Design a protein around this ligand. Structure first.
Ligand SMILES: COc1ccc(S(N)(=O)=O)cc1
Length: 126
């Protein structure tokens, strides 16, 4: 069901939260080799979260679930903001710009924590 596919998408999101926090620790400790691997893992994880989310939106649309479509359209826009920041962090890491990596790191934490409440509304609406 779309609701179970959303619980599966939410766990994939939680994975990225967990990986991101051990990356943040590794960045702070100067462990670039770890950061690099964590960035690659997060990239696959965000790619999968986005994929699960598009399928759920498309299915909510096919189902005519108007409220769920509205909330998912907002949530996916917010997701893309997160993704654009993540991609900027990855570039900041490639360039050795740690001041911008720090910035992008903190931005992505505020975009994910702010998106939290909406994600909690979609679970109910599907
Ligand atoms: C990578 O950008 C993201 C990831 C997750 C979320 S949330 N907190 O699940 O809405 C928002 C943006």
């Amino acid at each position: 069901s779309v609701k179970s596919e959303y619980a599966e998408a939410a766990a994939v999101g939680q994975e990225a939260v967990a990986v991101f926090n051990t990356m943040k620790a590794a960045f702070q400790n100067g462990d670039k080799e770890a950061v690099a691997q964590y960035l690659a893992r997060l990239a696959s994880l965000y790619t999968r979260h986005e994929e699960l989310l598009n399928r759920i939106l498309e299915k909510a649309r096919r189902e005519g679930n108007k409220e769920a479509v509205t909330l998912m359209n907002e949530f996916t826009a917010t997701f893309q903001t997160g993704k654009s920041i993540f991609n900027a962090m990855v570039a900041a890491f490639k360039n050795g710009d740690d001041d911008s990596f720090e910035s992008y790191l903190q931005a992505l934490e505020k975009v994910t924590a702010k998106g939290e409440t909406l994600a909690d509304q979609i679970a109910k609406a599907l």
